[PDB]
């Protein structure tokens, strides 16, 4: 696996960039290494980007970057899971906060997560 972190500005959007012109030589090399005359067998190229439009189109076409995975901003249902990923039942929990749950830490944490989500998405 070859991971190109920050692929959004990776080597250019070809034919763009006033300050730098390294694109015309760096982009074709990568375009020829992947899906060239001789092709790789078991190599996976993974890129992460914040600006999809800023990546050159010739590399985004199928055969070079096949599977396009989009991550969206979480909704309430995803926010509940994300909060559960951090508010584990191992944190020091206040006794007065467990008073209304009779010591049931998991249920208390679930209710706190629900209240937090409701407040944040009100």
């Amino acid at each position: 696996i070859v991971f190109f972190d920050e692929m959004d500005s990776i080597f250019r959007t070809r034919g763009t960039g006033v300050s730098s012109d390294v694109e015309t030589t760096v982009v074709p090399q990568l375009l020829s290494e992947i899906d060239g005359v001789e092709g790789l067998e078991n190599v996976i190229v993974i890129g992460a980007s914040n600006r999809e439009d800023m990546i050159d189109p010739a590399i985004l076409r199928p055969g070079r970057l096949d599977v396009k995975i989009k991550i969206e901003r979480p909704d309430a249902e995803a926010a509940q899971d994300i909060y559960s990923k951090y508010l584990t039942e191992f944190l020091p929990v206040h006794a007065d906060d467990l008073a209304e749950f009779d010591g049931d830490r998991s249920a208390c944490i679930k209710a706190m997560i629900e209240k937090v989500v409701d407040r944040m998405y009100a």
Binding site: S19, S20, D21, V22
Partner: peptide
């Protein structure tokens, strides 16, 4: 306001043994 790329010019060097 522009960027440049360098091409080197090698200098002669010779040593014995």
């Amino acid at each position: 306001g522009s960027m440049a790329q360098e091409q080197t010019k090698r200098g002669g060097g010779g040593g014995d043994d």
